[PDB]
Write a protein that binds this ligand. Structure first.
Ligand SMILES: *[C@@H]1O[C@H](CO)[C@@H](O)[C@H](O)[C@H]1NC(C)=O
Ligand SMILES: *[C@@H]1O[C@H](CO)[C@@H](O)[C@H](O)[C@H]1NC(C)=O
Ligand SMILES: *[C@@H]1O[C@H](CO)[C@@H](O)[C@H](O)[C@H]1NC(C)=O
Ligand SMILES: *[C@@H]1O[C@H](CO)[C@@H](O)[C@H](O)[C@H]1NC(C)=O
Ligand SMILES: *[C@@H]1O[C@H](CO)[C@@H](O)[C@H](O)[C@H]1NC(C)=O
Lengths: 308, 109, 113, 107, 94
């Protein structure tokens, strides 16, 4: 009987912010037939997942403030049944510290600014992260925020402070976060104190969910008899012109008529009264077509057209 | 030992050094792509590299240039192997497809 | 050989007629039209919308062409005369063409005295 | 057939008919470890072929798979455009340096 | 060349891109007394039912005794890669 045996030397090593790289090796005592062995991996905590992997290593992104627990077992894929060995598991403990001292409401926002200096990268991403101090945190807690994207890791330097000297919010003006990048952005916030240690809080932020599109600029509009034509420019972002949705808000200051028109182009044409005053505003966002739907841009500055 | 981030600079300097020693032949004819987004023709690129090594004289800086070329080919070989090392669930693969077609839209117009 | 005709669904779109509503805001009037939702929201729509007095015919009706819009305000209309309006719609994005949709149901409204 | 509208409709249908594609809960599909979709489009479309081989044959899922197959034909077209051509080696080295710079900087 | 059948010339099939295909065509009153025809659209073959309509075909008919018809084809969805084949097959065999 073909009795598959579990893999040995299964260790989980923290290789970066919110990553762990798992490694196993085939059992020396296994029968060495020409069978193409493969491996099945199970992530037990915190986000349950499982996958099939042929090589002896796999990288999984995950939050590490709640601890990590992974299981692996040798498998052999036959034509009728999936033979598997006994599960081999390893776990990564939770970091120490008194409960409730960890940070709460960690909200991170990413802007985009036009990098006019680098001839290669024209767009640059800036990060703003805010959080509230812990309930049982000591009065002299020193919180340090770290962000990581891809293989780039950095520590914050520009912070915001309350009356007690602790750190509420951080601001990265220059990040290696790609504006068109589509990888997870890991943010780790741990700290230190002379009275009681503080448990860290890491959270994987999707770039789409935290990217605040800038408002479009130069929204011009002209009367011509009874016809309005409104045009603007794409908002500053590494995504091209064709990857943005828009709406136009036209309000009449006399009667109160309001029109909202979503469109994919960059200009909108409408017919309104020739004896009323109007204001025009637009917003923008990265289309769900190009990137998963994210937060929408704020209203543009009002533009007042017509006469009353 | 070198990492996988300066081999390109090494190769670029070496190639800029020895253009005329490498384009000596006139009857030798090797393929060249025309499409943009060069990510998809690496195999043909290194096929041309192999033919060029089989023709060019292995002496001096050229030998270390071609050794560096093999070393950088190994990295793309590893990535191509990485594309099929792991097998995941249907939903994650569907999200991967959504990302793939989002790329197909933002670039690859 | 059998003679067959090739018809492409992409370049032969005839959409459903829109539904046109009329709103009296303050002392002015405006027209709002809605179309049946596609499975794909990225196909553009061009709207040709006509309004005329009751004494006049549809040939002499004011016509306005709008792209991706869903409302216009109407100009100052003469008082105490019945007004009619209607709308059609067609696709106007590259890769999707067709003929105009049928005229929408005429909507009537009386301007106040 | 505009490929932009093709991919756009394919994504819209993929969002709409997702649950029909996760109809069952045990099949595995090739998933690249990294996030370079362009390099491993071949394995991605092999996984698409597997999903085609095992899914309810009908409805709009088979209709979405038609757009996926046409996208695969596009991918294979610009696979074949790489080879089966001509040059005097000098501009081949030009192309090689171009690719080297691209993969060094953009990756 | 081959003189196209009047049903093929008068046929115009349009779409709402959501739920249905609308097709309009016509034939000749002299043609109805000898060979009845049925529209076929194609998967395998698929005859399509039709109803007599006096709404005039989208294309003019080259005979004064033309008889027009209208057809509605319900299908669930459309994509950009759809090409619909329409042919006319005599019901009785010649
Ligand atoms: C596995 O762990 C054992 C621990 O006793 C060690 O001796 C061995 O070198 C490790 N590697 C292999 C391949 O067995
Ligand atoms: C955390 O965020 C939730 C979201 O509404 C809020 O209700 C709660 O008060 C926040 N907690 C702190 C400590 O800010
Ligand atoms: C916080 O996390 C960083 C991770 O880069 C680590 O180096 C540091 O020791 C941790 N603690 C403090 C107090 O910074
Ligand atoms: C807007 O208009 C101003 C003045 O013409 C010009 O300098 C600027 O480049 C335009 N675009 C933006 C995005 O401000
Ligand atoms: C797919 O689902 C069916 C329905 O239960 C199941 O019988 C089959 O084993 C599944 N196939 C795979 C490869 O998981």
């Amino acid at each position: 009987k073909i009795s598959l045996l579990p893999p040995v030397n299964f260790t989980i090593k923290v290789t970066g912010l919110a990553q762990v790289l798992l490694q196993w090796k085939p059992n020396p005592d296994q029968e060495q037939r020409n069978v193409n062995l493969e491996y099945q991996v199970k992530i037990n905590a915190p986000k349950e997942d499982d996958y099939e992997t042929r090589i002896t290593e796999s990288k999984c992104v995950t939050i590490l403030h709640k601890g990590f627990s992974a299981s692996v077992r040798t498998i052999l894929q036959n034509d009728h049944s999936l033979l598997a060995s006994s599960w081999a598991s390893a776990e990564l403990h939770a970091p120490p510290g008194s409960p409730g001292t960890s940070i709460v409401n960690l909200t991170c926002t990413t802007n985009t600014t036009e990098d006019n200096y680098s001839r290669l990268r024209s767009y640059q991403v800036s990060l703003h992260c805010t959080w509230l101090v812990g309930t049982d945190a000591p009065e002299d807690t020193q919180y340090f925020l770290y962000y990581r994207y891809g293989s780039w890791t950095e520590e914050c330097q520009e912070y915001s402070k309350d009356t007690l000297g602790r750190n509420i919010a951080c601001w990265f003006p220059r990040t290696f976060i790609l504006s068109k990048g589509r990888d997870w952005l890991a943010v780790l916030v741990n700290g230190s104190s002379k009275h009681s240690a503080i448990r860290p809080f890491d959270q994987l932020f999707a770039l789409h969910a935290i990217d605040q599109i800038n408002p479009p600029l130069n929204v011009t509009a002209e009367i011509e008899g009874t016809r309005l034509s409104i045009q603007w420019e794409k908002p500053v972002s590494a995504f091209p012109i064709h990857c943005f949705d828009y709406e136009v808000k036209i309000h009449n200051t006399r009667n109160g008529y309001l029109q909202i028109e979503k469109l994919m182009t960059n200009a909108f044409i409408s017919i309104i009264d020739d004896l009323s005053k109007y204001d025009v505003q637009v917003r923008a966002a990265v289309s769900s077509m190009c990137r998963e739907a994210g937060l929408w841009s704020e209203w543009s500055q009002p533009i007042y057209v017509g006469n009353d | 030992e070198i990492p996988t981030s300066a081999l390109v600079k090494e190769t670029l300097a070496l190639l800029s050094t020895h253009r005329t020693l490498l384009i000596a032949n006139e009857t030798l004819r090797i393929p060249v792509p025309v499409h943009k987004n060069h990510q998809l023709c690496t195999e043909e690129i290194f096929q041309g590299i192999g033919t060029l090594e089989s023709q060019t004289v292995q002496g001096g800086t050229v030998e270390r240039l071609f050794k560096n070329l093999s070393l950088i080919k190994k990295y793309i070989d590893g990535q191509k192997k990485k594309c099929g090392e792991e097998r995941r669930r249907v939903n994650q693969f569907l999200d991967y497809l959504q990302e793939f077609l989002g790329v197909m839209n933002t670039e690859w117009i | 050989r059998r003679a067959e005709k090739h018809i492409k669904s992409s370049v032969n779109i005839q959409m459903a007629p829109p539904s046109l509503n009329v709103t009296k805001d303050g002392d002015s009037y405006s027209l709002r039209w809605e179309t049946m939702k596609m499975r794909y929201e990225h196909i553009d729509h061009t709207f040709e919308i006509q309004y005329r007095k009751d004494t006049a015919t549809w040939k002499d009706s004011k016509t306005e062409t709008l792209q991706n819009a869903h409302s216009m305000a109407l100009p100052a209309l003469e008082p105490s005369t019945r007004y009619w309006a209607r709308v059609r719609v067609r696709t106007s994005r590259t890769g999707y063409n067709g003929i105009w949709s049928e005229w929408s149901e005429a909507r009537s409204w009386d301007t106040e005295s």
